[PDB]
């Protein structure tokens, strides 16, 4: 099975502080898209809210004619929508280009491939959802050492098209199902080869 990457779009809803950390381009395309011959699979769309301190200035006046400005940190709420995708081969189309898969982890979970909140050596962490990191690499000769076969993603709203169109929330063939994250009550899982 070939892995065409993941990506994540973002739209600011109040403030403009969040999409910097929420948006994630696809390594393979330079954009929020899938390589030719791959299909975007929409895993999830949700809004992230966050409290932050914004610097603001305000004028206090005595009799509207003697005025002074003061600037302070003020507590505000930032909100933004993220829309999460992964890329799956619709057909065999042109090969062998695709990404090596090196596990996933969050700020509060651990990556079974490396047993650390990290990716294997030479791998890039890509942002997905609010805090998931997806470990990815492009160099087969150094990556395959640290790569596990990848069997797809699926979520509470979207099945896994690699199962063998019907989109079943399942893992294909000889792959085992593992929980990635629960994002605002929505389950997101991934599939890897049977193993510890
Ligand atoms: Cl949802």
Author numbering: 376 to 539, 548 to 579
From the reporting publication:
Perforin-2 (MPEG1) is thought to enable the killing of invading microbes engulfed by macrophages and other phagocytes, forming pores in their membranes. Perforin-2 (PFN2) has recently been identified as a novel and critically important component of innate immunity conserved throughout the animal kingdom and evolutionarily close to the last common ancestor of the MAC and perforin-1 (7, 10). Because of the presence of a canonical MAC-perforin (MACPF) domain, PFN2 has been proposed to form functional pores in bacterial membranes, leading to bacterial death and control of infection. However, unlike MAC components and perforin-1, PFN2 is initially synthesized as a type I transmembrane protein and found associated with the membranes of intracellular vesicles in which its large ectodomain (consisting mainly of the MACPF domain and a unique P2 domain characteristic of PFN2) projects into the lumen.
We determined structures of the P2 domain in isolation by x-ray crystallography in two crystal forms, with two crystallographically distinct copies in space group P21 at 2.05 Å and eight copies in space group P1 at 3.17 Å. The resolution of the peripheral P2 domain is relatively low in the cryo–electron microscopy (cryo-EM) structure, and in particular, an extended β-hairpin region was not well resolved. However, by determining a structure of the P2 domain in isolation by x-ray crystallography (at 2.05 Å resolution), we were able to build an atomic model for the whole complex into the cryo-EM map. Liposomes containing phosphatidylcholine (PC) and phosphatidylethanolamine (PE) showed no sedimentation of the P2 domain. When adding to these base lipids increasing concentrations of phosphatidylserine (PS) from 5 to 30%, the binding efficiency was gradually enhanced. Given that negatively charged lipids such as cardiolipin, Escherichia coli total lipid extracts, and LPS from E. coli and Salmonella enterica are characteristic of major bacterial membrane lipid species, we also tested and confirmed preferential binding of the P2 domain to these lipids. In contrast, the P2 domain showed almost no binding to liposomes containing sphingomyelin, which is a neutrally charged lipid found in animal cell membranes. Truncating the β hairpin (residues Y427-V452) within the P2 domain (P2Δhairpin mutant) abolished its binding to PS, cardiolipin, and E. coli lipids, confirming the role of this region in membrane binding by PFN2. Thus, membrane binding seems to be conferred exclusively by the tip region of the P2 domain β hairpin.
